[PDB]
Amino acid sequence: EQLANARRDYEAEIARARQEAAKIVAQAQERAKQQEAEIIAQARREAERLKEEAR
Amino acid sequence: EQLANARRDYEAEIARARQEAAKIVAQAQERAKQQEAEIIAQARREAERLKEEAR
Amino acid sequence: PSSREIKRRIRSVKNVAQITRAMEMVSASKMRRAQRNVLATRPYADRMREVMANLTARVVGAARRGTLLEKRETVKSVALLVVTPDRGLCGSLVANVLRRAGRFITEQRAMGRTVDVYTFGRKGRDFFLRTGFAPAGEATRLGDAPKLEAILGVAISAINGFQSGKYDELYIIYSEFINTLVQRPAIKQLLPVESPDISTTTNVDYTYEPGEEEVLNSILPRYVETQIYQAVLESIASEHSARMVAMRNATNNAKDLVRDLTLSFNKARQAAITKEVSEIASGAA
Amino acid sequence: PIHLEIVTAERVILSDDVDMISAPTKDGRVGILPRHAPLMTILEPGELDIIKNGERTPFAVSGGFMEVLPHRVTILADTVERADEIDEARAEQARAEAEARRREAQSERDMALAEAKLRKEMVRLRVAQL
Amino acid sequence: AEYFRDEGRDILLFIDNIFRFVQAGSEVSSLLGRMPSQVGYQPTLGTEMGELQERITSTKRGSITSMQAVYVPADDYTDPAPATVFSHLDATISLERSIAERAIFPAVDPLASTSRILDPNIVGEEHYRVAQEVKRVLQRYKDLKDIIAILGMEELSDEDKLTVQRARKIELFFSQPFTVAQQFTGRPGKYVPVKKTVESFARLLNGEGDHIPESFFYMQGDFDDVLAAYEA
Amino acid sequence: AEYFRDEGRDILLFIDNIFRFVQAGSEVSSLLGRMPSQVGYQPTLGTEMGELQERITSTKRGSITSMQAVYVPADDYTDPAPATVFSHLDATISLERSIAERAIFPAVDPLASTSRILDPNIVGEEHYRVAQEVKRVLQRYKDLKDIIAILGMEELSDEDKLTVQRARKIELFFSQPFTVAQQFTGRPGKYVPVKKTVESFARLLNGEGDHIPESFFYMQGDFDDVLAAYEA
Amino acid sequence: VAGKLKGELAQFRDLAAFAQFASDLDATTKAQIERGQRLQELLKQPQYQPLPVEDQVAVLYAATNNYLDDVPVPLITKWRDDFLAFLRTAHPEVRKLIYDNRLDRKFPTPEVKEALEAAIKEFKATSNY
């Protein structure tokens, strides 16, 4: 039972580490995506301002 | 003696599991930083391209 | 013959061919597993067979053998165990077996013996419930792999019969299995006379603990039950092989019919195109 | 060191060599040793015991027979059970027998084959214009 | 209809036997000396059908919704007239004799009745999900009915018997009391919104409808209306 | 090609999809206004097929031999276009997909492919005898393709088991390295003369090479190549 | 990656008449039928949801190799709809790694092979189906 518990605990610790890794990577991805969307929106607004300047 | 060395090996395995968890989390943090930087750089270059094509 | 109804016929016959092909595959698989079951059952029957040989080599006393091993002189009443596949499509086996039941029920009825019938299967249960020979015993819903427990419900009664005097013999009509393509029907006697060549038994001697009489009286019903079980398993294997052969023949016939219908459909298609272009050219001109 | 065979009308249970057989003969329990004299006995509902190198396996037998040659033992038992397993139920032997057997081994077979016959009969009515 | 559509009001137009329109054109062409096309049909088949089926559309002001009737010669959907009609169809409703003779007042067959709107992008994910949940227990058309015929359900099915119960309940529930028939059968007409229909069928498929017997869904507008009846 | 034929040379003419030539003729006839014949075919179908494929003859000076791909409309070998093509054909080669899925590049189906010249009075009695026996064992193998999938190779009787074993070896031996495929496969091409082919296949059938497995017959030349390889 | 997909789909089509009799069949035939059913359910796709080349390659690599065998057939589609999402969020680098060397002659190069194997194993361990 101690060998079985060692295997189970190793697998559980690795799985929890991978879950934390996935969570933090997902948070970074969503933050980067929202900041990218903000930058794109600002660029589009500046382009519309340039069009109004041309008009 | 088998029980003694099995307990010792379980302790060593759980220590190795914690070490691997730390390594995985550190690698995930590095990947998250790299991916955020890449996404932000891509967004900035795209914004510059939209401004240039708007001009 | 309108180039579209022929297409429906082709589709229907192709569906028939596909269903028949699937049934043929599964009948082949179930025939293989039934053959495996028969092979697994062989050692028990063989062992009890040389046990019969040895014991009958002894206790030859007619009074001692008055129990089951006895041969009723009058033979006024007889019984037939018929094992018939439960579902049809089997081919000619269901009929070949229910016919030999007749040849027997007659040749016997002709001996003045009152022939009665215990039937294993719904196909048999009916041929006789119709003929009027309500099966003295009917075992239906028989699976590819039944257990000896099943035949017991009927074999107990047939045996209690050869003991109640109600019968003077028990024959089983079952479907043998000669080749993966052949499945001749066959009859076996169920009276446990035994007594093979003294050479077969080798006269192995034992110290029968409960007694020679008790061992014989408790072993003969088990021997006839084992014979019935072996016959039923062989019948199941022959049923599956016959169904496989019948579905192979039906699939070949369906493929030939598909070819003929394809030729007819193509002729109708060419005729339809010719008629259409002819009437279009006539309308143009 | 005697060639024991627990055979059954369905299948063979064991065919190994055994130290001791604690057979439940009808008159009384009988032990068998590698050079036992020829014998033929009727069993009663009981728990036959197989002694194999000091290990006792309690095969419950609800009935059956036994032939003991000097060199081999054959048990023509009606039913042989191993309650010692206990988990046999949870084990596929019974657990699968409940689902992997009968449920799909038979019920599913009957359903599929009957459905095939039904589709055949319906389409053979539908083709009754050729 | 287009006069009223110009006012912004919604119009429902029933072109009964639109196929007889096509046939008419064919004759008009044959007597006009036009060169025949395909099986005697007019060369201007697609354009003639378009000039009629394109005025049936939803503009900003109003919409002319059309529910036509199509008669296929013999049973040939390959024929040019049914094919041309189907090229301009958005939904098919297959009324059946079997459903009608079972006292199910709306004889619409749950199967063989399609609509291109039935995708999650337009109706909604829940509407599509339930509409696929139903017509799936009937995808087999209760194919169990064939098995029941030669097995008697094998006495009962391991779980299929439930599916049969749900299928019968929903088939009964498809029926609805109509207001126009209110003075014939003496039963008030029930108007059921699409949201009520989707919610009712979804909740019935979850199993809330496993407590009421059949014939309690026989002519009732919503699942809630069935419940009121069970409580009373 | 007739210029080279007139110089005494022997020419191979490869016509891809002669049915497309037939279709072009039919379209030209329809455009010209000529009355249609049978299934949308030109009235001058036989005459047009005779203007072609009649200059493809073996004359005194030279010979033009033609291989013509033929597309069969639907799957009709009785359709007027493939019928008129077949009326002018001396040999048919039937490439088949399954024979090519297994890496037998010369994927000629021996049972389907036939030829008029395969008669004793032209190719010789020995050539005719071996070819028929090659097809006979292959035909027996095709009949047993069902049975092998039915019960396994075990049920097959002996000799029949040999014919299946021999038939697989011979159909593998139908493979042959090609000089034009030398660079792709890295294997030199082998030109096997007709007499060498006849001798090799007769010596395969009579019993020689039976001990050799199915391999060593794959992509080889004569029987001599199959043995030399087995020794090495 | 798609060669084994095509082969297994063809094998399933040859046995397509046998799906409703899968229980009473050979173990290899049942396995082929089950794999074909899984692949056919994988090919099922909603509307207006095109999958990029790297996502298709990842899903087909997971399918051709014995990784969806434990997943039941009705959930195979769902499995895909989850797995790619996992790769879209948890492991964005493996998708780029697949897309970068999609033109490599020996595409399952050890780096991408280990990356994809690890991603599939990590997804299967966390999820339950």
Tab-separated table of N, CA, C and O in Angstrom, chain D residues 74-111:
chain	number	residue	atom	x	y	z
D	74	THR	N	-10.754	-37.857	-11.011
D	74	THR	CA	-11.691	-37.082	-11.807
D	74	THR	C	-12.929	-36.789	-10.978
D	74	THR	O	-13.475	-37.685	-10.328
D	75	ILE	N	-13.368	-35.537	-10.995
D	75	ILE	CA	-14.533	-35.102	-10.235
D	75	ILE	C	-15.586	-34.674	-11.245
D	75	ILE	O	-15.481	-33.603	-11.853
D	76	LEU	N	-16.612	-35.505	-11.426
D	76	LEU	CA	-17.703	-35.206	-12.351
D	76	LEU	C	-18.807	-34.439	-11.620
D	76	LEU	O	-19.979	-34.810	-11.617
D	77	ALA	N	-18.399	-33.343	-10.989
D	77	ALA	CA	-19.295	-32.602	-10.115
D	77	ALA	C	-20.333	-31.827	-10.915
D	77	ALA	O	-20.058	-31.335	-12.012
D	78	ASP	N	-21.539	-31.723	-10.354
D	78	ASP	CA	-22.612	-30.995	-11.022
D	78	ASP	C	-22.297	-29.507	-11.109
D	78	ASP	O	-22.363	-28.909	-12.189
D	79	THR	N	-21.953	-28.891	-9.979
D	79	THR	CA	-21.613	-27.476	-9.914
D	79	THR	C	-20.427	-27.289	-8.981
D	79	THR	O	-20.400	-27.849	-7.882
D	80	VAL	N	-19.441	-26.507	-9.430
D	80	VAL	CA	-18.227	-26.249	-8.599
D	80	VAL	C	-18.132	-24.743	-8.346
D	80	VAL	O	-18.139	-23.982	-9.333
D	81	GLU	N	-18.056	-24.331	-7.077
D	81	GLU	CA	-18.044	-22.881	-6.746
D	81	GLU	C	-16.840	-22.561	-5.855
D	81	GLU	O	-16.402	-23.461	-5.114
D	82	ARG	N	-16.330	-21.330	-5.928
D	82	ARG	CA	-15.190	-20.925	-5.063
D	82	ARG	C	-15.602	-19.706	-4.232
D	82	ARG	O	-15.200	-18.581	-4.593
D	83	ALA	N	-16.370	-19.928	-3.161
D	83	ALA	CA	-16.798	-18.817	-2.279
D	83	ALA	C	-15.560	-18.156	-1.667
D	83	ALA	O	-15.655	-16.980	-1.263
D	84	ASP	N	-14.443	-18.887	-1.613
D	84	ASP	CA	-13.184	-18.334	-1.049
D	84	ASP	C	-12.835	-17.043	-1.798
D	84	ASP	O	-12.361	-16.093	-1.146
D	85	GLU	N	-13.075	-17.013	-3.113
D	85	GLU	CA	-12.805	-15.788	-3.910
D	85	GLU	C	-13.606	-14.627	-3.316
D	85	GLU	O	-13.005	-13.557	-3.101
D	86	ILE	N	-14.903	-14.838	-3.061
D	86	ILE	CA	-15.770	-13.782	-2.453
D	86	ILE	C	-15.946	-12.638	-3.459
D	86	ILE	O	-17.104	-12.327	-3.798
D	87	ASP	N	-14.839	-12.046	-3.919
D	87	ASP	CA	-14.901	-10.915	-4.883
D	87	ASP	C	-15.336	-11.439	-6.256
D	87	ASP	O	-15.476	-10.615	-7.178
D	88	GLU	N	-15.546	-12.753	-6.377
D	88	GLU	CA	-15.953	-13.358	-7.673
D	88	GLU	C	-17.134	-12.565	-8.243
D	88	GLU	O	-17.159	-12.350	-9.470
D	89	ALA	N	-18.072	-12.153	-7.384
D	89	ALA	CA	-19.208	-11.321	-7.844
D	89	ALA	C	-18.661	-10.047	-8.495
D	89	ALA	O	-18.893	-9.858	-9.702
D	90	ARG	N	-17.961	-9.214	-7.720
D	90	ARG	CA	-17.347	-7.973	-8.266
D	90	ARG	C	-16.459	-8.346	-9.457
D	90	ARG	O	-16.336	-7.520	-10.382
D	91	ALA	N	-15.863	-9.541	-9.423
D	91	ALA	CA	-14.994	-10.000	-10.531
D	91	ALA	C	-15.843	-10.217	-11.786
D	91	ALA	O	-17.049	-10.499	-11.643
D	92	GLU	N	-15.228	-10.108	-12.967
D	92	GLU	CA	-15.972	-10.272	-14.245
D	92	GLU	C	-16.705	-11.617	-14.228
D	92	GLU	O	-17.813	-11.691	-14.791
D	93	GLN	N	-16.118	-12.630	-13.583
D	93	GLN	CA	-16.737	-13.981	-13.552
D	93	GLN	C	-18.243	-13.831	-13.322
D	93	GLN	O	-19.015	-14.511	-14.025
D	94	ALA	N	-18.638	-12.972	-12.377
D	94	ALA	CA	-20.076	-12.731	-12.114
D	94	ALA	C	-20.456	-11.321	-12.579
D	94	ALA	O	-21.525	-11.173	-13.203
D	95	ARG	N	-19.607	-10.329	-12.290
D	95	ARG	CA	-19.912	-8.922	-12.662
D	95	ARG	C	-20.087	-8.829	-14.182
D	95	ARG	O	-21.120	-8.288	-14.622
D	96	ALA	N	-19.122	-9.344	-14.947
D	96	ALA	CA	-19.262	-9.357	-16.421
D	96	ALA	C	-20.410	-10.297	-16.796
D	96	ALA	O	-21.205	-9.939	-17.682
D	97	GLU	N	-20.495	-11.452	-16.131
D	97	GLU	CA	-21.613	-12.392	-16.396
D	97	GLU	C	-22.928	-11.609	-16.351
D	97	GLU	O	-23.867	-11.987	-17.079
D	98	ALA	N	-22.979	-10.553	-15.532
D	98	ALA	CA	-24.203	-9.724	-15.431
D	98	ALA	C	-24.308	-8.776	-16.633
D	98	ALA	O	-25.427	-8.624	-17.160
D	99	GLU	N	-23.194	-8.163	-17.046
D	99	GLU	CA	-23.247	-7.156	-18.142
D	99	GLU	C	-22.560	-7.702	-19.398
D	99	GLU	O	-23.223	-7.765	-20.452
D	100	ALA	N	-21.282	-8.077	-19.287
D	100	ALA	CA	-20.523	-8.587	-20.455
D	100	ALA	C	-21.165	-9.884	-20.960
D	100	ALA	O	-20.855	-10.289	-22.097
D	101	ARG	N	-22.016	-10.506	-20.141
D	101	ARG	CA	-22.705	-11.757	-20.557
D	101	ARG	C	-24.215	-11.588	-20.373
D	101	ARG	O	-24.611	-10.793	-19.496
D	102	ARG	N	-25.014	-12.296	-21.179
D	102	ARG	CA	-26.498	-12.235	-21.065
D	102	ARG	C	-26.992	-10.858	-21.522
D	102	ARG	O	-27.790	-10.810	-22.476
D	103	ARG	N	-26.533	-9.788	-20.868
D	103	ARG	CA	-26.998	-8.415	-21.207
D	103	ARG	C	-26.674	-8.116	-22.675
D	103	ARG	O	-27.570	-7.629	-23.389
D	104	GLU	N	-25.439	-8.396	-23.100
D	104	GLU	CA	-25.035	-8.151	-24.510
D	104	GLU	C	-24.727	-9.492	-25.183
D	104	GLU	O	-24.979	-9.613	-26.398
D	105	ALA	N	-24.210	-10.455	-24.416
D	105	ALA	CA	-23.862	-11.780	-24.977
D	105	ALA	C	-25.133	-12.459	-25.497
D	105	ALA	O	-25.027	-13.260	-26.446
D	106	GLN	N	-26.284	-12.149	-24.895
D	106	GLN	CA	-27.553	-12.813	-25.296
D	106	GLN	C	-28.602	-11.760	-25.660
D	106	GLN	O	-29.058	-11.767	-26.821
D	107	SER	N	-28.972	-10.891	-24.713
D	107	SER	CA	-30.035	-9.929	-24.987
D	107	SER	C	-29.719	-9.089	-26.218
D	107	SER	O	-30.569	-8.918	-27.099
D	108	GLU	N	-28.499	-8.551	-26.296
D	108	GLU	CA	-28.121	-7.756	-27.460
D	108	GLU	C	-28.088	-8.606	-28.722
D	108	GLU	O	-28.490	-8.145	-29.797
D	109	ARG	N	-27.607	-9.846	-28.614
D	109	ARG	CA	-27.620	-10.750	-29.759
D	109	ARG	C	-29.040	-10.963	-30.263
D	109	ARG	O	-29.308	-10.869	-31.468
D	110	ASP	N	-29.968	-11.243	-29.345
D	110	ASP	CA	-31.351	-11.483	-29.739
D	110	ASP	C	-31.961	-10.235	-30.362
D	110	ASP	O	-32.626	-10.316	-31.399
D	111	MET	N	-31.726	-9.068	-29.756
D	111	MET	CA	-32.260	-7.827	-30.310
D	111	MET	C	-31.744	-7.585	-31.723
D	111	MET	O	-32.526	-7.314	-32.640
